[PDB]
Design a protein around this ligand. Structure first.
Ligand SMILES: [Zn+2]
Ligand SMILES: [Zn+2]
Ligand SMILES: [Zn+2]
Ligand SMILES: [Zn+2]
Ligand SMILES: [Zn+2]
Ligand SMILES: [Zn+2]
Length: 458
């Protein structure tokens, strides 16, 4: 017995449900078998770490063009077979385009019916044709440029948004719009060289979610993709944004019905490495949720003329963006902004009441109790999008039993004082006012609006 009287956190566990492997050429794959979704569609995603940032000025639009070629013709397919695949390759809801191209990636997507081994074979053949034997010729390029529509999407979905144009300023993404048309006539030889340079197996990951046979599909993936050649000499491009400037701004927008004033915060994102970071993230997230929740409730009890409120957070380009959106006619803007700003001032100073906190925590405890019920009811495409979001944005995916344990301990440990301090800290960082106006609406003086706002927040 040691004579003393008055004298760590566990490692986070990656979710072992996600089986992973690497082929000898560096091709990566990840598989989530879903026997709880035995009849749901099989989702396949091929991410290639090649986007518009890979393009020099003689290659503008090349990354966006390549996937359209893959829809004109594919080496393993007759026209009839290619059409048959794609007629049966789109999800029943939240359908995805065949490919999405962006600054630092291209994403190919197929959604197959359940219990169709033939279509799984075809899907893998289409994806391997695309990955290593893309049909790049004068004939396919001409055909692609003469389509009535553009089946290839971008991320962000609308690069032309005045908000996006503003947000892009000071970044490395300028002059690399991912959906730009190619310069014609196309140097087909240069296009093929670009494809061979940048479509290398070490820059690819295949993801599969569904009630599949994990033993046979691993073997099929190896046989489909192990012959790909090439290696990147440098790390793949990573798209990064500059910090959001602090100044208020008005942006005219041609699709807006009415104004949206956004109260925004933008900060560097630090991926969660350990349990302590996880807890800090959850405290911050819950404060954000609490505030939105509280304002929504106050609004339901105290109607404000023509106000609709929105709230969201995203992690993208290594930045965390959290926004409160006030959708309002311009005639009601100052009143509606004042309504929200007075809530923020009160929450900054005093936070939640104990009763409000206890309500919140009952609700969060309820949601946690529903964890596995929610999971069982989750469509394979949602499982897939969650995984890609985790992977692309660096937001950690942990074993669900560990999640349940750590989240329970977070909720049971959290005090009013702690949540209110987090609220105070968050709201003590100045917001950034971003006003979107409809085209044709007289410009609002956002400096004046900022002064009014500053008055309330004093
Ligand atoms: Zn022509
Ligand atoms: Zn396009
Ligand atoms: Zn938003
Ligand atoms: Zn309040
Ligand atoms: Zn689905
Ligand atoms: Zn277990």
């Amino acid at each position: 017995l040691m004579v003393g009287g008055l004298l760590q956190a566990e490692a986070l566990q990656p979710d072992p449900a996600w089986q992973q492997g690497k082929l000898d050429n560096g091709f990566s794959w990840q598989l989530l078998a879903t026997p709880q979704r035995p009849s749901d569609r099989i989702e396949l995603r091929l991410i290639v770490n090649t986007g518009s940032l890979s393009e020099n000025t003689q290659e503008v639009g090349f990354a966006h063009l390549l996937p359209r070629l893959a829809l004109m013709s594919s080496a393993s397919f007759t026209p009839a077979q290619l059409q048959s695949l794609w007629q049966q390759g789109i999800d029943n809801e939240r359908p995805l385009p065949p490919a999405i191209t962006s600054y630092d990636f291209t994403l190919y997507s197929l959604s197959l019916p359940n219990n169709r081994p033939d279509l799984l074979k075809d899907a893998l053949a289409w994806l391997s044709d695309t990955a290593g034997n893309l049909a790049v010729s004068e004939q396919t390029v001409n055909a692609a440029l003469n389509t009535a529509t553009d089946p290839i999407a971008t991320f962000p979905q609308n690069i032309q948004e005045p908000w996006w144009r503003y947000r892009l300023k000071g970044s490395s993404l300028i002059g690399h719009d991912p959906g730009q048309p190619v310069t014609q006539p196309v140097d087909v030889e240069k296009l093929k060289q670009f494809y061979q340079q940048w479509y290398t197996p070490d820059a690819m990951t295949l993801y599969v979610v569904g009630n599949v046979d994990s033993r046979s599909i691993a073997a099929q993936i190896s046989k489909a993709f192990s012959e790909l050649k090439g290696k990147r000499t440098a790390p793949a491009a990573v798209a990064t944004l500059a910090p959001l400037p602090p100044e208020p701004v008005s942006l005219m927008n041609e699709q807006a019905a009415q104004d949206t004033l956004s109260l925004m915060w933008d900060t560097p994102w630090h991926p969660i490495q350990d349990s302590m970071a996880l807890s800090r993230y959850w405290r911050s997230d819950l404060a954000r949720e609490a505030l939105f929740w509280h304002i929504k409730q106050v609004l339901e009890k105290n109607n404000q003329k023509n106000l609709k409120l929105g709230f969201d957070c995203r992690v993208q380009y290594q930045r965390a963006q959290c926004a409160i959106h006030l959708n309002t006619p311009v005639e009601n803007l100052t009143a509606n902004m004042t309504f929200v700003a007075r809530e923020l001032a009160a929450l900054r100073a005093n936070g939640l009441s104990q009763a409000e906190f206890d309500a919140l925590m009952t609700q969060k405890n309820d949601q946690l109790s529903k964890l596995f019920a929610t999971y069982a009811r989750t469509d394979t495409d949602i499982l897939m999008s969650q995984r890609l979001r985790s992977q692309q944005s660096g937001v950690v995916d942990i074993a669900p039993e560990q999640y349940q344990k750590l989240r329970q301990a977070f909720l049971s440990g959290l005090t009013l004082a702690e949540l209110n301090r987090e609220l105070k800290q968050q709201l003590s960082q100045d917001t950034t006012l971003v006003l979107m106006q409809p085209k044709g609406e007289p410009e609002v003086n956002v400096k004046a609006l900022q002064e009014i706002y500053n008055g309330i927040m004093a």
